[PDB]
Design a protein around this ligand. Structure first.
Ligand SMILES: *[C@@H]1O[C@H](CO)[C@@H](O[C@@H]2O[C@H](CO)[C@@H](O[C@@H]3O[C@H](CO)[C@@H](O)[C@H](O)[C@@H]3O)[C@H](O)[C@H]2NC(C)=O)[C@H](O)[C@H]1NC(C)=O
Ligand SMILES: *[C@@H]1O[C@H](CO)[C@@H](O[C@@H]2O[C@H](CO)[C@@H](O[C@@H]3O[C@H](CO)[C@@H](O)[C@H](O)[C@@H]3O)[C@H](O)[C@H]2NC(C)=O)[C@H](O)[C@H]1NC(C)=O
Ligand SMILES: *[C@@H]1O[C@H](CO)[C@@H](O[C@@H]2O[C@H](CO)[C@@H](O[C@@H]3O[C@H](CO)[C@@H](O)[C@H](O)[C@@H]3O)[C@H](O)[C@H]2NC(C)=O)[C@H](O)[C@H]1NC(C)=O
Ligand SMILES: *[C@@H]1O[C@H](CO)[C@@H](O[C@@H]2O[C@H](CO)[C@@H](O[C@@H]3O[C@H](CO)[C@@H](O)[C@H](O)[C@@H]3O)[C@H](O)[C@H]2NC(C)=O)[C@H](O)[C@H]1NC(C)=O
Ligand SMILES: *[C@@H]1O[C@H](CO)[C@@H](O[C@@H]2O[C@H](CO)[C@@H](O[C@@H]3O[C@H](CO)[C@@H](O)[C@H](O)[C@@H]3O)[C@H](O)[C@H]2NC(C)=O)[C@H](O)[C@H]1NC(C)=O
Lengths: 346, 346, 346, 346, 346
């Protein structure tokens, strides 16, 4: 018989009247495109720009009655992408592209196959840099929902309807891990149908839930801030009433708590609200600032001067150095109970 | 009847004499293009480069009498962007482009429709990186007006006239938020008509007012600078006349006020003038520098030595340590009144 | 006779029926493409992005019976890449591209030659930025296996089969060195055959083992952390019972151990687990934190006060200053034995 | 009559013999192209790369006798840039391009008009990243002359001659300001005619003088270096002969003078010579290093020990503490006179 | 006579049989291409990536007997680059491209001219980012030889032979200076002929010797490290036996020697070996670490306690403070002799 590209040239080129500019089912029902993606790569989830780079295989399936061949014996006629500008294709785009490209190495990475009843599979490889707003109210313990939405640009709802398929509409690669987050297996598949003054346009989207990994900030942020709070508690044991060394232990633990507070937001967006790492690095700034403020209470009370009055202010200098020695591991530990149970209920 | 692209091929291609190089209403009135944009994304407003990245849907509407079909029954003939190089289009550009691109993922993201009387809607998706000059005289409390202006390049005022439409000429996406600024709902829509030695060229523009979010600099810049000013006031309570510890408390609070002053302009343009964060981080540098300068007044007066003269310089060492203990929370708090009321009237 | 391009124009163009869209051995056995690469450049192995940039010469060899010329006297007809869009080529791609490009300087850097029996060599120059997951559990002493895999996109296993050849399927350039790693000469050449809902697709890959160079982190990370642990041991010799100087030697060696701990992960991914440089910079943080905690045991015991009791607490102040003077070079050196022998067995 | 593009198609296309490959005035005088630019944007003047990004409207005017229409009634036939590859255009380039691009948003931003005698105006919008060598001998007080030069590539002096016009050959936009520099209104317009082994080629250029804004480095560099020099002068008033506090005031003001010296060249090229900020941050490093060296003269002389000899070394400890208290605001202020008057004569 | 492009159209297009796919001197001697470059710009020599960006005019000269016109009166027929895809051109590439581009501003920056005997000059402007391995064993005093090599891709030695010409095969622009290096005038011009399993391919290259400028690291690295070594020598004059101030002068000069050591490799590749700035910043780390280790010898010997024994340990506390006061400017200055004479012989 005929070779299939030449068999398909008479199905398209100038003898069958196939016009690649005019959609199937024209002057009738709209085209029902059913979509599913395959995430090869995921990640580089920046928060300064609030975006993430995904790498998908975008599969699209629609029906074209004009491509319904009826006397070739096989079931799937493929097509190399040189003659892929000769069929109708849906004008899908992404509402939050922020730059995206195809992949054109050794061949344009595209796929086409045409079934006997005109079912057209069409798979392209796309790298997207998708925008998602970061809600950083509880910053190391937040579940980010970053989405991607697939709209139509030139055709309204009575021309082209996007759907997800029901056979697992978002697949994910086999060992797809992330350095900072983990990807949850529940992916919401819902509609996002838009409206403009141009009209209404179809839209489908897929939410991706991105639970963080708390195990990094529990090494850089929370534990070296925990040691400086213990370091200020050395000053209650130093020289048993007062010293010039307790000043320098009260100065320095405020410095590398302030510098570490400024280093807790080194590569973050400049959000207006106050977040979970901002109410840990500022309350523990208060425990190391009150330790030198504790010494200013000792060095002013104990340096005051009958024969009875000598032992009355040193006894007010030991009680301030044996209550504050135990009350600071009481106020700090009850904050430690209040901080993490609040961010487990949330 | 005819399919619409084939119906439009005889309206354009070589049988109707439609030349895509020659504007409508030729040798007559100029073409009245009416424009409106739709901001999908906004932000990444850098100040080192003084620019911002917007993502718009640029809609244009003009009238073409040559496209006035009169016997097709519908009201809107669309066109896929393959045959969009076959009509006349206005040569709109942006006077402050600084790099811009189209969006060509899965289809060139363009729109066309032609009404019965020749009204042509034309919508393209553009990512712009628009230049705006930053007036940073009062830096965390400024209202930036960053603009975008839409000129004509090859055609003068007697050939092509840009207008905004009256039905909401700048729309904004639904939940369009910003990390650092907030976008005000009042957008000025005015003319910017240019003049060269080539002639005069039409221009329309849209001002965008960008009020900041003070809630970030009120966490990193103003509060850790507030604590160091309190930290120098510890030195008035330390050892009740003088100490070697009051030197190290007078040295160190100048260091991490100077280092924090140099860190208050880490990612800013190198402007010549003096700004609001520069008159807070330098006046509070003076409160922590005068505290060690207060100790140089104590340690020189009190270390001077009849039997009357012993109690005359210690009484000049307590008065300097009980006036300065209260006058510094008087001079600093009256600066705190003077600083923020000045930047609320402005 | 004929010039070879004109001799090949009648072998391809419209007189021989050679269709560049239809694979050889059609309706028969699949095409057996045999591949081998030549690594010109290698490196820029980033860990923030977890990728690496390679520069290869991708050679492909398949058989085309339609190109079997039989009366030209030579053995290898080449072809400049202008008429290289006129033959069939396999649609090889890389499953972890993350951006890649050709090289088109002074000529498209491509090669073609056609043997007498239709054997087609095809060599192109590609720059790849290949993704590989970093397993950083033992960070300066890990052997990274970063791969690259060569799939087919549009053709299944019954259409196109990739193979490596047996004559050294991965060559490497002559003096190809790396700044941070070294490349091992054993390269695994195995199959990675994929499966989708589209079907199954061929895949071959090549593992690259990248042993690090420990000699850099043995200069910046481990030795300046070794000196601060020695620096805290000065405090056992300072003023022979206690001093205000031993406080400042116990404060400061915790600071530049904490700051150096935060600088041990300056340009690394934010992984959740705990790595080899994280259990060196935190255990040696404990040796410099226990030195000031040793002084808090001295300054509280020795400052307590019959005539017998005066020499009983100073003898408990020398024993704590002659056991701890030797036990800390015992506990630290047995950790030094335990740390490096663990990472030589692994 | 005829529409003008169709009137110009018979002036160019295959009936008039107009060849777009062969210059006007051929086998005669060379083509006299007269140029003028319009700077829309200017800036991002980096010094690490030693370049600057300009955005110009490059206007070119030459004479083509083959385009001299003689029976159309108007005076200026324009042309949309689709048929702009059909006329002769000069092969102007920039000798210091370092990357440059056109602007192709919504239309290729080009202009053409043809007068009745064949005068051809041609305006394109270009973004350039032009290289200029930075002479940083006196770094905050230098006048940089960064140039741009417009050569011919394929045609020698007997084929194509570039000129500036006399009606303001370099215009500048209306409110074109800069963050770091200011642009002087005097722009030199001179020749730069090149010579190779290929021959000699025409060249015109325009110098741009870029005076800096001293008001930034007078806030970050010179004033916080001025305060540390005052901070070392506290040590002459501290404890009136000697102290352990004067050591820590002599140590620390060398540290944050050295760290501030290393931060005075954070984002600069690594030039070999010594610049104006390098002889301020090193001489003021000597005033804070001699202050601790002053204490080493006090603490060695005054700690030496008949009944006459007790008051003879303390009188050599007050004279060294009342000469050096006044001589350092004498040597530093005469350096302050010598530093700025030297950089006002230059 | 004929216009030259039309005179050259009959020399190339379909009447002379000139095939642009088939090299000159076919079935005979190979094509002898003679090359020479002209370096316009040079620099941005990064060491993290180990590459450098050059901007060349690549001239190529070969002989084509098919272009030997014999009845046109002139000597050099040029050609605008529109019809430059119509001649044979050599497939030169660079073996270490790492990304490169042409320059296509206002015209494709290309040149062609054809002499009467068929000599073809061909000059293109290229920006290269060429890879070179950095040998940083003696880092501020090394002579880097960074190369560039010009290979053939599709043609072997019996088809196409590259040569340098003898009339100055590498020219350099007039005032081509560098910020960090200087370019030596001796440039080696030698062969680099490659061999693969494809065959052997021609190659020519040009070594560029890049001597550094020592005058930058002699300001940031060596002199502020020289002052800290002098700063530790203050401690021998402080309080004449021992002090708590000599501890803080022995602590701090180890800190900002360690921090300055970590800042001596801020923007360098992470090489395994030990370099010249690594044996200066570590030996001078030993002079400031032995100064506090000198105090631990004083404070333990001098604090030991008959009537004879009182003056026997203070005399062992002055001898350790008058030998070490002079021996450290003896051991450091003999290292200063040993360090720089070693790196002048090399
Ligand atoms: C593409 O998908 C759309 C929506 O899934 C399909 O439209 C639906 O088509 C059915 C079949 O005719 C319609 O059912 C009809 O409903 C009318 C009452 O409205 C009833 O009188 C008829 O007997 C029949 O049951 C259905 O209303 C319609 N829905 C919408 C929202 O338009 C469309 O047919 C699909 N196209 C193709 C080619 O499969
Ligand atoms: C495009 O917009 C321009 C400006 O909006 C329109 O130009 C205006 O056209 C009107 C209609 O002819 C002109 O009014 C006339 O004014 C003259 C006096 O100048 C009067 O004698 C006539 O009876 C008539 O009322 C108006 O002057 C003119 N304005 C300008 C600035 O040119 C133009 O018509 C629009 N084009 C289309 C196709 O709608
Ligand atoms: C491309 O490579 C594939 C796999 O290497 C080749 O397929 C193999 O072809 C041989 C030759 O016919 C097959 O052997 C046959 O096996 C059947 C039993 O299945 C036996 O009855 C026959 O007598 C014969 O020995 C072999 O099964 C087949 N293997 C597979 C997996 O398909 C193919 O021939 C190669 N194509 C070319 C053009 O070289
Ligand atoms: C393009 O510009 C060049 C230079 O501005 C023009 O060349 C100049 O043309 C004039 C007019 O013929 C020449 O003057 C002649 O000088 C000779 C002596 O050399 C004298 O005998 C004649 O009577 C006449 O005055 C002039 O020398 C020549 N200059 C150069 C450097 O070539 C050229 O004409 C311009 N082309 C056009 C089309 O305007
Ligand atoms: C391109 O350059 C190559 C090498 O420079 C030229 O090849 C050389 O051509 C000469 C001229 O025929 C050869 O000399 C001959 O040597 C044989 C012995 O081998 C001798 O019997 C002859 O009498 C004659 O002297 C020379 O061997 C040959 N060298 C190589 C390496 O092939 C070639 O001719 C040049 N092509 C053109 C068009 O100039």
């Amino acid at each position: 018989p005929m070779p299939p590209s030449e068999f398909l040239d008479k199905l398209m080129g100038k003898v069958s009247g196939y016009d690649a500019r005019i959609r199937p089912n024209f002057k009738g029902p709209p085209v029902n495109v059913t979509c599913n993606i395959f995430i090869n790569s995921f990640g580089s989830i920046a928060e300064t720009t609030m975006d993430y780079r995904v790498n998908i295989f975008l599969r699209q399936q629609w029906n074209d009655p004009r491509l319904a061949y009826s006397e070739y014996p096989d079931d799937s006629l493929d097509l190399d992408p040189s003659m892929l500008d000769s069929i109708w294709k849906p004008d899908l785009f992404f509402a939050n592209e922020k730059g995206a490209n195809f992949h054109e190495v050794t061949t344009d990475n595209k796929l086409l196959r045409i079934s006997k009843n005109g079912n057209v599979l069409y798979s392209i490889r796309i790298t997207l840099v998708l925008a998602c707003p970061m809600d950083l109210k509880n910053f190391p313990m937040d579940v980010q929902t970053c989405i991607m939405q697939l709209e139509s640009y030139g055709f309204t709802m009575n021309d082209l309807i996007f759907e997800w398929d029901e056979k697992g509409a978002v697949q994910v690669a086999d060992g797809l891990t992330l350095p900072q987050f983990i990807l949850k297996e529940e992916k919401d598949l819902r509609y996002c149908t838009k409206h403009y003054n141009t009209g209404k346009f179809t839209c489908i989207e897929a939410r991706f839930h991105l639970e963080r990994q708390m195990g990094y900030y529990l090494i850089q942020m929370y534990i070296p801030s925990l040691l400086i709070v213990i370091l200020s508690w050395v000053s209650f044991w130093i020289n048993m009433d007062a010293a010039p060394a307790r000043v320098g232990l009260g100065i320095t633990t405020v410095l590398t708590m302030t510098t570490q507070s400024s280093g807790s937001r080194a590569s973050l967006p400049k959000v207006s609200y106050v977040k979970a790492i901002d109410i840990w690095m500022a309350v523990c700034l208060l425990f190391v600032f009150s330790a030198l403020l504790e010494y200013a209470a000792v060095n002013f009370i104990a340096r005051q001067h009958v024969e009875e009055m000598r032992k009355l202010f040193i006894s007010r200098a030991k009680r301030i150095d044996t209550v504050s020695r135990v009350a600071f591991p009481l106020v700090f530990l009850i904050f430690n109970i209040f901080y993490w149970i609040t961010y487990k209920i949330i």
